[PDB]
Design an enzyme around this catalytic site. Structure first.
Site, PDB file in Angstrom:
ATOM      1  N   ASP A  87       0.841  -1.206   0.000  1.00  0.00           N
ATOM      2  CA  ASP A  87       0.000   0.000   0.000  1.00  0.00           C
ATOM      3  C   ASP A  87       0.870   1.247   0.000  1.00  0.00           C
ATOM      4  OD1 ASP A  87      -1.820   1.937   0.236  1.00  0.00           O
ATOM      5  OD2 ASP A  87      -2.826   1.009   2.008  1.00  0.00           O
ATOM      6  N   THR A  88       1.071   1.837  -1.204  1.00  0.00           N
ATOM      7  CA  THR A  88       1.910   3.042  -1.299  1.00  0.00           C
ATOM      8  C   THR A  88       1.257   4.257  -0.659  1.00  0.00           C
ATOM      9  OG1 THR A  88       1.058   3.508  -3.520  1.00  0.00           O
ATOM     10  CG2 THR A  88       3.075   2.182  -3.391  1.00  0.00           C
ATOM     11  N   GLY A  89      -0.041   4.203  -0.403  1.00  0.00           N
ATOM     12  CA  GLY A  89      -0.724   5.278   0.258  1.00  0.00           C
ATOM     13  C   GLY A  89      -0.698   5.234   1.763  1.00  0.00           C
TER      14      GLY A  89
HETATM   15  C1  LIG Z   1      -6.453   7.137   2.972  1.00  0.00           C
HETATM   16  C2  LIG Z   1      -5.000   6.903   2.642  1.00  0.00           C
HETATM   17  C3  LIG Z   1      -4.288   8.220   2.760  1.00  0.00           C
HETATM   18  C4  LIG Z   1      -4.273   6.066   3.728  1.00  0.00           C
HETATM   19  N1  LIG Z   1      -4.807   4.775   3.856  1.00  0.00           N
HETATM   20  C5  LIG Z   1      -4.107   3.845   3.043  1.00  0.00           C
HETATM   21  C6  LIG Z   1      -5.028   3.577   1.829  1.00  0.00           C
HETATM   22  O1  LIG Z   1      -4.225   2.970   0.898  1.00  0.00           O
HETATM   23  C7  LIG Z   1      -6.287   2.726   2.271  1.00  0.00           C
HETATM   24  C8  LIG Z   1      -5.951   1.235   2.534  1.00  0.00           C
HETATM   25  C9  LIG Z   1      -7.067   0.546   2.901  1.00  0.00           C
HETATM   26  C10 LIG Z   1      -7.582  -0.410   2.053  1.00  0.00           C
HETATM   27  C11 LIG Z   1      -8.746  -1.101   2.341  1.00  0.00           C
HETATM   28  C12 LIG Z   1      -9.382  -0.901   3.541  1.00  0.00           C
HETATM   29  C13 LIG Z   1      -8.857   0.009   4.434  1.00  0.00           C
HETATM   30  F1  LIG Z   1      -9.485   0.113   5.500  1.00  0.00           F
HETATM   31  C14 LIG Z   1      -7.702   0.751   4.120  1.00  0.00           C
HETATM   32  N2  LIG Z   1      -7.336   2.734   1.269  1.00  0.00           N
HETATM   33  C15 LIG Z   1      -8.559   3.326   1.284  1.00  0.00           C
HETATM   34  O2  LIG Z   1      -8.988   3.957   2.159  1.00  0.00           O
HETATM   35  O3  LIG Z   1      -9.367   3.049   0.173  1.00  0.00           O
HETATM   36  C16 LIG Z   1     -10.754   2.851   0.323  1.00  0.00           C
HETATM   37  C17 LIG Z   1     -11.474   3.578  -0.761  1.00  0.00           C
HETATM   38  C18 LIG Z   1     -10.764   3.398  -2.106  1.00  0.00           C
HETATM   39  O4  LIG Z   1     -11.552   2.576  -2.970  1.00  0.00           O
HETATM   40  C19 LIG Z   1     -11.883   1.378  -2.301  1.00  0.00           C
HETATM   41  O5  LIG Z   1     -10.543   0.771  -2.070  1.00  0.00           O
HETATM   42  C20 LIG Z   1     -10.368   0.489  -0.695  1.00  0.00           C
HETATM   43  C21 LIG Z   1     -11.285   1.404   0.045  1.00  0.00           C
HETATM   44  C22 LIG Z   1     -12.521   1.541  -0.956  1.00  0.00           C
HETATM   45  C23 LIG Z   1     -12.882   2.938  -0.746  1.00  0.00           C
HETATM   46  S1  LIG Z   1      -5.077   4.297   5.444  1.00  0.00           S
HETATM   47  O6  LIG Z   1      -5.389   2.836   5.419  1.00  0.00           O
HETATM   48  O7  LIG Z   1      -6.108   5.059   5.920  1.00  0.00           O
HETATM   49  C24 LIG Z   1      -3.653   4.504   6.285  1.00  0.00           C
HETATM   50  C25 LIG Z   1      -2.718   3.497   6.270  1.00  0.00           C
HETATM   51  C26 LIG Z   1      -1.540   3.666   6.972  1.00  0.00           C
HETATM   52  C27 LIG Z   1      -1.367   4.756   7.654  1.00  0.00           C
HETATM   53  N3  LIG Z   1      -0.295   5.100   8.323  1.00  0.00           N
HETATM   54  C28 LIG Z   1      -0.395   6.269   8.929  1.00  0.00           C
HETATM   55  N4  LIG Z   1       0.575   6.772   9.710  1.00  0.00           N
HETATM   56  C29 LIG Z   1       0.606   8.163  10.212  1.00  0.00           C
HETATM   57  C30 LIG Z   1       0.515   9.336   9.234  1.00  0.00           C
HETATM   58  C31 LIG Z   1       1.832   8.980   9.800  1.00  0.00           C
HETATM   59  S2  LIG Z   1      -1.812   6.949   8.664  1.00  0.00           S
HETATM   60  C32 LIG Z   1      -2.331   5.709   7.682  1.00  0.00           C
HETATM   61  C33 LIG Z   1      -3.467   5.599   7.043  1.00  0.00           C
END
Ligand SMILES: CC(C)CN(C[C@@H](O)[C@H](Cc1cccc(F)c1)NC(=O)O[C@H]1[C@H]2CO[C@H]3OC[C@@H]1[C@H]3C2)S(=O)(=O)c1ccc2nc(NC3CC3)sc2c1
Lengths: 99, 99
Positions: A25-27
């Site tokens: 997960d690059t995001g």
């Molecule tokens: C929102 C992005 C910015 C970040 N997220 C990473 C995204 O890649 C997530 C991965 C994902 C996938 C599936 C279910 C999930 F529950 C989550 N995808 C996401 O929400 O997509 C959504 C959206 C896109 O279309 C479809 O595909 C999956 C799902 C559905 C609707 S994060 O998981 O919230 C995150 C991760 C690590 C992290 N480390 C942090 N550290 C502190 C700051 C230092 S903060 C932080 C926050």
């Protein structure tokens, strides 16, 4: 390997003696895994994403084998819907995006 | 380009006449942008992520220029904390993960 993105980029990981699948997960800045049994001490943390926040347990200097590469770093454990390998570990295995 | 992951993989996009930055996100199935002014019809949708869900407006067959490559597809618009380019558009620009 090279991985195209027509399907989710899932890989097998080994962590804490257990085999799991996780999404490259690059995001994701950090690595977040489903509730699981890890040894050792941890610290409470909250993290945010698309739909608000979650409480996680922060474990440091954890060994994780990701598709056959070893990495050591922080793993956050809590109620994430998917196991996510974030950039903290993707950098250690040498992963890049290319286009 | 090749992009390493020591920093967030942000790119400039052009959509709806507007310039924005967005995160190349292999963990995102779909593309989700901050509230913004887009022309055209849309449909309501809910989407889930780490901390629960959000309500978005779904726009189809939207043109987006991503770091100089054109792509047409679905864009979801709503209260995401970050602009995210998901696999629906990453595949069109030929993006891969490599390690
Ligand atoms: C929102 C992005 C910015 C970040 N997220 C990473 C995204 O890649 C997530 C991965 C994902 C996938 C599936 C279910 C999930 F529950 C989550 N995808 C996401 O929400 O997509 C959504 C959206 C896109 O279309 C479809 O595909 C999956 C799902 C559905 C609707 S994060 O998981 O919230 C995150 C991760 C690590 C992290 N480390 C942090 N550290 C502190 C700051 C230092 S903060 C932080 C926050």
């Amino acid at each position: 390997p090279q991985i195209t993105l027509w399907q989710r980029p899932l890989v097998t990981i080994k962590i804490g003696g257990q085999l799991k699948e996780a999404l490259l997960d690059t995001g994701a800045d950090d690595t977040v895994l489903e509730e699981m049994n890890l040894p050792g001490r941890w610290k409470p943390k909250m993290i945010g994403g698309i739909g608000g926040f979650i409480k996680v347990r922060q474990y440091d200097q954890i060994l994780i084998e990701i598709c056959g590469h070893k990495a050591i770093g922080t793993v956050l454990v809590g109620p994430t819907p998917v196991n996510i390998i974030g950039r903290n570990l993707l950098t250690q295995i040498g992963c890049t995006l290319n286009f």
